[PDB]
Amino acid sequence: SELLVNTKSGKVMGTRVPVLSSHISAFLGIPFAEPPVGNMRFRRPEPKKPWSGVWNASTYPNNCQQYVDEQFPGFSGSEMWNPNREMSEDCLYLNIWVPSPRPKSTTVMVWIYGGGFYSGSSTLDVYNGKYLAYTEEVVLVSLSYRVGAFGFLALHGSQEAPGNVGLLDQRMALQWVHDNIQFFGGDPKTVTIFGESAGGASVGMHILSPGSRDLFRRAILQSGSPNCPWASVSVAEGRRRAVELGRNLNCNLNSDEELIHCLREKKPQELIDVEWNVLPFDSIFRFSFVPVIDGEFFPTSLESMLNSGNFKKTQILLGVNKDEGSFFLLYGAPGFSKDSESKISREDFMSGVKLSVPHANDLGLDAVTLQYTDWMDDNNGIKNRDGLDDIVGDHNVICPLMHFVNKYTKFGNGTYLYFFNHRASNLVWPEWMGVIHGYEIEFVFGLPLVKELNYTAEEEALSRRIMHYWATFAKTGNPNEPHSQESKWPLFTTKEQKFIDLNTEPMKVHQRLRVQMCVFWNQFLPKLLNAT
Amino acid sequence: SELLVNTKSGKVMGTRVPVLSSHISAFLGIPFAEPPVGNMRFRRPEPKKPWSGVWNASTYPNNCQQYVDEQFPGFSGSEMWNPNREMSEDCLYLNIWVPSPRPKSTTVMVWIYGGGFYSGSSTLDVYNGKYLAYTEEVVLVSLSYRVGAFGFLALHGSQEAPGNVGLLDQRMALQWVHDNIQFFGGDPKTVTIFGESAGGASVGMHILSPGSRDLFRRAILQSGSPNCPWASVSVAEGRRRAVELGRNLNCNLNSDEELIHCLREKKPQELIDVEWNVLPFDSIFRFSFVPVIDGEFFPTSLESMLNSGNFKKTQILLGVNKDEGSFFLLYGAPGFSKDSESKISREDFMSGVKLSVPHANDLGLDAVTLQYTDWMDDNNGIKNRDGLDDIVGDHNVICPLMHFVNKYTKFGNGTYLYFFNHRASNLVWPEWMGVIHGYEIEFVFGLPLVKELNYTAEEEALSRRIMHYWATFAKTGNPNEPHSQESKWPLFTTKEQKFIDLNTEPMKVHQRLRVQMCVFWNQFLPKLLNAT
């Protein structure tokens, strides 16, 4: 049986899933770790003990315990990101889509979900790997990992809650893939990790961590980078936040042991209920429990790692979307709402800047304000809206990624960069939000190939285009087909810094993505903030 | 006789001068002060003792002692600004052009030359008042004043060299005009002061100084403003420079008396020979001996005066040229020369920024560099040249003027603003220098009306246009003719901030001149420099 697979952990039995007038095999909810429940909460993950008999891998697993978005109840735009399974601390499972007939040894793609490290699920409809697996004949894996306090609570010095354990969950899943994917027909020598936002940051973190480097071949980073301002904190900030969590739940704080024992006796939802209260500033695009620069997963600071080339040297493909910031302004900044054009006043504007750069003094806020205001028309609600959108996206996603990319390419073996700026024809979010954080994913996973989804033909072709770039890069380290008539995605180099747009129009090549603003964010503002 | 005039100082006899196929009367070299020679060097001026008999006012007077530009010997472009008479400390004279027949009581215009307070002459060909006087039927006066150490050496506390005495020379000439111009047919109630660069700054200084305010009716400021960074220094910087001058000439420095007695025994040229050595920084557009904020001529700081409205409330007309900086880059910055396109390298660029903002720390230099670099093409020699040109002009002329204008208009009774961007057809300077500091003057004084000068017809019409605006504003406080078919120069207001271009094309109205860059220079950079 195609649906029966014997692994080093035990036998698994899958299920046949139809896809695009055909079928493939799916192995859903395979365990790669022991349930991190009870006294194991906050601990590093443990490998799953092998099992006798046959593991039923015919249904999706539980999702990890997480904050749930209720901002727009019943609205597909936001609920599509919410967990679609029962939530549980027993959530360390992975899913595999395998072409039929079973390959012998083909390209493997492993997806790491995003969600600001406070959320996410491997089981979402927009992450269904069957179209990709089927259309590009790759073995498609999606992993899971602990989020929020369960995954990133950090009390540096202790071994009960060391921090970064969510990252170690990813790593453990990458290890199981390395050791077992051959039985599903995958080539563990040709494994590509890919993820979006916190997932793309994660990908870059595995590139940096000496401990993950060997578990994969190449990497794809979508709208995220390891050095994003929201993706990590110091060991000292991590512990302040942990203690403050303890304070919100009336814990004994005399010591780490006391604190930790208190938090392990709380129900998951009690933790989640107070999670947002531990942020140090009134801010947007900032998350409570995130990776920590601990001197182990991350031996030194990221900048130090990037500058010295202390990282995996291989090929990467990566890029951003045109309106990365709009999601966060809608949810948190004044003046923005779902059902209006969200034309923004000067007052709201400057209040948005303060929220967007919570760590800056007044001079720096000023600097930001100056760079993004048109002083010939400073009261234009639309210009104000759009400038804040660029601020949030530039500072939190694009410019950190551009810095990663330039730093990386100096030592890497190949970089491919893109800019995704297609506004999908069937978007349910308002037009002012433009090309939103996360809305390239449905194209990467081939949803427009599905008729009832209502995409145009141009959109299906775009999807097919993007899938073949990703899968081809995964297989060979280059998104381009050598013997192809189609236009060439050029290599990003130090010198020329070329990139492509991704949309339904003919490929256009550009250079130095957002270089004017990223010099501000990556060089000037940090210098200002240190000198002041 | 039309050429004979009895004043309160004594009788004067003029001369008939031909102008544009006609003739007018000229009274040249009339004394308004005692020769500030000997023990009077550096002192406040003294009114000229009246004389018996008839003063021969048929020839131009001596020019004041000044640095002479030899950078391009024999080149008309620079020598046209050099003194064209014998230099002398006995130089406090004024010149008057009077329509024929002698008016009864008409509009009076008084010209104050520029030259960075280290130089200038009332007798230059580009300052010949006969065309203006003749074409607009105004009584045209040009004054003179001490420059360099002779006029602005400042040892605050002493009465031998108090500083600002060059300004007091201007004031004394304005007093004589007030008291005597009626005899030449002028209306001392309707006197307009006008000047360019240090002359325009001077004009604005007389608007501020409670002591000059009453001596004139309205003001015209060309390419200059009282608050320019180069136009004044503190009493403490003034004295440092004076002492350093003393140091360069081996003076006794035990006290002001010693220092001053030493400097009065030196020949003029010995002072001039070391003048440039006392600047505090390697800089461009910075002058050694300038007005001092002394708490008398200027009761408080200028900003304080402008903010509180402590100034003459009347009408003003003022404006700038498109390439104010090029002159100073040519003479002082690396990469620039007279006979090349002066395409500028990144190295030269950043060395130009340092020279242009000598008082900034590295963070501020950075800020400047960022605002004026195109980071998509940072090695473009032409973009680099042009950005440095804008830097020098923005920081030293336009943005200080825009700040003056906005501050002034809040309390004044009428503002008219312009932007002069005509490159004269017969310019002898290279094209990269564009529309240069000082090259609006020849249009204001009507030189294009003179056939042998080689201007086009469009240029003559432009000139005629500009003269009639200036003279009409002088007469009524508005450059526009009420009953006129021609298009209207709109009033500058706080709200709308409108201005006009001045060139051979049809009038176009704009708003908020260089507002993007002047917010940087007038608000952000000063805040940065104080916080750092």
Ligand SMILES: *[C@@H]1O[C@H](CO)[C@@H](O)[C@H](O)[C@H]1NC(C)=O
């Ligand atoms: C990648 O590595 C191979 C083998 O070392 C090398 O020959 C090739 O030029 C490199 N490619 C890039 C883009 O650096």
Ligand SMILES: *[C@@H]1O[C@H](CO)[C@@H](O)[C@H](O)[C@H]1NC(C)=O
């Ligand atoms: C100038 O002053 C007059 C008289 O006070 C006033 O009526 C007029 O409105 C003022 N003009 C401007 C432009 O303020």
Ligand SMILES: [Xe]
């Ligand atoms: Xe994409």
Ligand SMILES: [Xe]
């Ligand atoms: Xe800036």
Ligand SMILES: [Xe]
């Ligand atoms: Xe002008």
